[PDB]
C-alpha cells in the first residue's frame, strides 16, 4: 500500500491585549489590527522547536514519538503568517494539541497559533489558501474606499505570494 498524510494550515494572530486603546468597531478594522505581520525574529526553525517542546511536556515519550516520525515544515511566509505543516493521518490530533497548548513562541509573547484547515492532498490546500486570501481582500476593500487602509500591512502581499514559494509539487 501507500502511506497517507495530512496537511495543516496554521496562522498566527497577534491580538493587541493592551489597555487604553479604545479601538473602533468594524469588520475591517478588527481584521486589519489582528493580522499584523510577524516581527521576523520567528523563523522556520523556531516554530518547529517550539512545537517539539510543547509535545514532550503535555505528552510523554509515546506521545512525542508517534508524531516526530514524520513532521516537516514546508512553507512559511512572514508578510502573512500563514504556514503549512505535514504529518501522518492517524497522528494529526496530537499535533493540534501541541498547537493549542503552546504560546510564547521562542521569546515573542502574547500570540495565538490558529490551525484553520486540515486536508489530505497538497493540491487542495493551495486552492483553499487562495480562496481565503481572496475573501480577506474582498472584505477589506468593501467597508469603505479601500485606500483608507493605506498602511498596506497586507494589501500588497496576497497578490505577491502567488507562487513565489508555493512550487512544492
Amino acid at each position: 500500500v501507500r502511506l497517507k498524510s495530512r496537511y495543516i494550515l496554521f496562522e498566527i494572530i497577534f491580538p493587541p491585549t493592551d489597555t487604553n486603546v479604545e479601538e473602533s468597531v468594524s469588520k475591517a478594522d478588527i481584521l486589519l489590527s489582528h493580522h499584523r505581520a510577524s516581527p521576523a525574529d520567528v523563523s522556520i526553525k523556531s516554530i518547529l522547536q517550539e512545537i517539539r517542546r510543547s509535545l514532550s511536556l503535555n505528552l510523554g515519550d509515546y506521545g512525542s514519538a508517534k508524531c516526530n516520525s514524520l513532521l516537516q515544515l514546508k512553507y512559511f511566509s512572514n508578510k502573512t503568517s500563514t504556514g503549512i505543516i505535514r504529518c501522518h493521518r492517524e497522528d494529526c490530533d496530537l499535533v493540534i494539541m501541541a498547537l493549542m497548548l503552546m504560546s510564547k513562541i521562542g521569546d515573542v509573547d502574547g500570540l495565538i497559533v490558529n490551525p484553520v484547515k486540515v486536508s489530505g492532498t497538497i493540491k487542495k490546500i493551495e486552492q483553499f489558501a487562495m480562496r481565503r486570501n481572496s475573501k480577506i481582500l474582498n472584505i477589506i476593500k468593501c467597508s469603505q474606499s479601500s485606500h483608507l487602509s493605506d498602511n498596506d500591512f497586507i494589501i500588497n502581499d496576497f497578490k505577491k505570494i502567488g507562487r513565489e514559494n508555493e512550487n512544492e509539487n
Partner: protein, 243 residues
C-alpha cells in the same frame, strides 16, 4: 453557528460597580472571540446564594446589555445573552429562585460540598450544572447522583479555560474532566470557555480534538458547540414569557 457561553462579567458581588479598564478588556476579548468564529455569546455572573439580593425588581442584573455593546450588535452580527452562576454550599438560606428567573435567561449552579451537590440535583430551577475544575473536586462521584438530573432536562458543562493558565491547574483539570465524562456516560455534555483575557480563547477544530482524546466519542464532540448549546439557549429565551 458556534455558541460559547461562559464569558465572565467583571463584578464580584452586588456592592461594587464596574470600572473602565474592565469593560475595555471585555470589549476586546469579545471582538477576538467574534473573529475566531463564534457568533452567539453569553455573559456569566457569580454570586454566593447567601447574600442580600436587591429588593427592587431592577438593578439585580448590572450587565446593562442594551446600552453597552450597542455598537457591537451592529457593525458585526454577533449576539449576546446573560446568565448567572449561583454558588450553592448550604441546604438553606432561602432566596428561592422564583425571583431572579425573570431577570436572566440562563441559570446555573456551582456546588462545592456533598450536601450542596446532592441538593442541586434534588430540586432546584437550574438548567445547567458546572464544577470548579481548577482543583480539588469532591471525588468519587458516581452515576447515582447524576443520573436523576441528566434524565431530566439538565446538562453538564466543561470550560477548558483552566488548561491554559498554569500547569498545576492543568493537571487537576485533566484529572477531573475524565471523571465527569465517565460518570455521565457521555450524555448531555456542552463546552464553554472561561476567557479572562483576549489571549485565553481558542478556535473550534482543535478543542473538539482536545475533548475527543480524553474519552468523549467523536460523534458527541460535534454537538457540544452546536445543537445542545443551541437548545439550552432556545429554552432560556423561551422562558421570557413570564413578563
Amino acid at each position: 453557528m458556534l455558541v460559547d457561553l461562559n464569558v465572565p462579567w467583571p463584578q464580584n458581588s452586588y456592592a461594587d460597580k464596574v470600572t473602565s479598564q474592565a469593560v475595555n478588556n471585555l470589549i476586546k476579548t469579545l471582538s477576538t472571540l467574534h473573529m475566531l468564529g463564534y457568533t452567539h455569546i453569553a455573559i456569566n455572573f457569580t454570586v454566593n446564594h447567601s447574600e442580600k439580593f436587591p429588593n427592587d425588581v431592577k438593578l439585580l442584573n448590572p450587565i446593562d446589555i442594551k446600552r453597552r455593546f450597542g455598537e457591537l450588535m451592529d457593525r458585526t452580527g454577533l449576539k449576546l445573552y446573560s446568565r448567572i452562576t449561583l454558588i450553592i454550599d448550604d441546604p438553606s438560606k432561602g432566596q428561592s429562585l422564583s425571583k431572579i428567573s425573570q431577570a436572566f435567561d440562563i441559570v446555573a449552579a456551582l456546588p462545592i460540598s456533598e450536601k450542596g451537590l446532592t441538593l442541586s440535583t434534588t430540586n432546584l430551577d437550574i438548567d445547567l450544572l458546572t464544577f470548579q475544575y481548577g482543583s480539588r473536586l469532591p471525588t468519587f462521584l458516581k452515576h447515582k447522583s447524576i443520573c436523576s438530573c441528566v434524565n431530566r432536562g439538565v446538562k453538564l458543562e466543561i470550560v477548558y479555560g483552566y488548561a491554559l493558565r498554569d500547569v498545576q491547574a492543568r493537571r487537576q483539570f485533566v484529572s477531573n474532566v475524565r471523571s465527569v465524562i465517565r460518570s455521565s456516560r457521555s450524555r448531555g455534555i456542552v463546552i464553554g470557555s472561561g476567557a479572562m483575557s483576549p489571549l485565553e480563547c481558542r478556535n473550534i477544530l482543535g478543542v473538539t480534538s482536545l475533548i475527543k482524546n480524553l474519552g468523549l466519542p467523536s460523534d458527541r464532540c460535534s454537538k457540544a458547540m452546536g445543537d445542545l448549546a443551541s437548545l439550552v439557549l432556545l429554552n432560556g429565551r423561551l422562558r421570557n414569557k413570564s413578563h
